[PDB]
Amino acid sequence: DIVMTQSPSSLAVSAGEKVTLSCKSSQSLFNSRTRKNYLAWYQQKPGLSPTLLIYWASTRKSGVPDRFTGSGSGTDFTLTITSVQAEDLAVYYCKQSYYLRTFGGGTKLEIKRADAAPTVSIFPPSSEQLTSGGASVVCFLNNFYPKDINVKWKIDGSERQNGVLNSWTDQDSKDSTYSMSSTLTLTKDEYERHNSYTCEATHKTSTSPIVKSFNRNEC
Amino acid sequence: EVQLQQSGAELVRPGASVKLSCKASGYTFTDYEMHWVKQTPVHGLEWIGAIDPETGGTVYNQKFKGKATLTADISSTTAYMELRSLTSEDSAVYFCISEDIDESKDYWGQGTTLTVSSAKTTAPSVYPLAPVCGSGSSVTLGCLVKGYFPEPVTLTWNSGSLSSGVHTFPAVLQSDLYTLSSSVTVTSSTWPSQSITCNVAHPASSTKVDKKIEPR
C-alpha cells in the first residue's frame, strides 16, 4: 500500500511565472526490468474528469503543452509548469502505478492578478416563480478580485440576514477573477408584504459599497 | 473513438447497496484493465480497485476491501462496481477508467454522483432571470435552478454555443434541496434580438429543460 504525499497543497502565482509541484512516494517507483519510474501526473479542472499529463515520470503525453515537464526518480518527483497560463488553474495529482494505484493528495494551483471591482446585477422573482407561489431575489457580484467579498440585503431599508444563500464560482479560467451569487429566498406572501429590495456589495477595491435596488410595485 | 458511459446520478438509501455500471466501447474490451476511482472534497481522488476483464482478476485499495466488489461482463463490454452497507461516507463521485496497453493513454468515464440518502428525487424548477424593468453597453441574464435533489445538474447556454461571459455557481443545499444559478453577460446588440436559452439537465430525474430568457 504505497503512500503518496504532495506539496504544497495549494499555491498562487501570477501568469507567466514558473511553478514546481512536488510528490514523494513511500517506496521507490523504479522498475528494474522495464527501467521505468511508474509515476504519472494528472490535471483536474472543476466538473471534469482528470486528464493525464506525464507518465513514466518524464514522458509528456502527446498533445500536452510543452510548458509541462515532469522529472524525478526513486521516491521524489516534480511537475514543472515553465510559464503558468490563466487556463492552467486546476488541482494537479500525482499517481503511482508501481504496485497498485495510489493518488497523491493534490496541489490546487490558483492565479494572482490585479484587483478588480465587482459588477452587481439584481433580479426580482421571475413571473414564472411567482405563479408557482415562491419568490427568490438574486444578486450576482461578477468578475471581482480578490475572492473575499461581503453582501448585505436590505428589505424596505432594513438589514435582512435570514434566507440568504451565497455561492462563489471557481476562479475564472480566462481572466482569473471570481464571481458570487447571493439569493434571498422568501415565500410569495412574504415577498408581497414588502416593497424595496436591495443588495449591497462591499469589496476591498472601494470603501463605498456597490448597491443595486428595485421596488416590487414598479415591476 | 473510445468511450466509457456512466450514469449521471444514483440515489440510494443508507444501509442498502448499489451496482454502478460502466459501459465501454471503441476498443477490444478484454485488452484493457478497468479501474475505479472515488472523488470527494475531503479525500480528493482515491483509487478503489481494478479488474482484468480477461481473467476476472481483481485487486483493491485496502480501505475499500469489503466495501466494493468489481466485476465485468465481457459480452456486453460493461464493468460493474458493487458498494455495500452504504453510509453518507460513500456519497461521492465515482469514475471508471480504462488503461490503454499504450501507457500514454487512459480513458475516463464522466463520473456517477452517488448520494446515500432517504430523501426523494425532486426535479428542479428552472426560472429565467431577465434584467430589472427600466440601459447600458451590456446586459446580464440569469438562470435559477431551484429545489432539486440529488446532485448534480449541468447547465449550458444555447446548447453550449454561448460559453464566454458565463458564470455558473456551485449548488448550495437547504432542507434536502439544492439550488444553483448561472449568469451570462452579452452586449445589448445581441439580446434580446437574438435568442438566449438556458438548458438544464438533472440526470437523477432524467430532466432536460429549456428556458428562453424573455424581457419583463
Numbering used by the authors:
A (entry chain A): 1 to 219
B (entry chain B): 1 to 134, 137 to 218
Direct quotes from the study:
Here, we report the first high-resolution crystal structure of the ghrelin receptor bound to an antagonist. The ghrelin receptor structure, as a class A GPCR, shares a canonical seven-transmembrane helical architecture and an intracellular amphipathic helix 8. In addition, several reports indicated that the ghrelin receptor exhibits strong ligand-independent activity. Moreover, both a Fab fragment antibody (Fab 7881) specific for the ghrelin receptor and an antagonist, Compound 21, were added to bRIL-conjugated truncated ghrelin receptor to increase thermostability.
Fab 7881 binds to intracellular loop 3 (ICL3); the flexibility of ICL3 prevents the crystallization of the receptor. Thus, Fab 7881 seems to stabilize ICL3 and improve the thermostability of the ghrelin receptor, allowing it to form crystals.
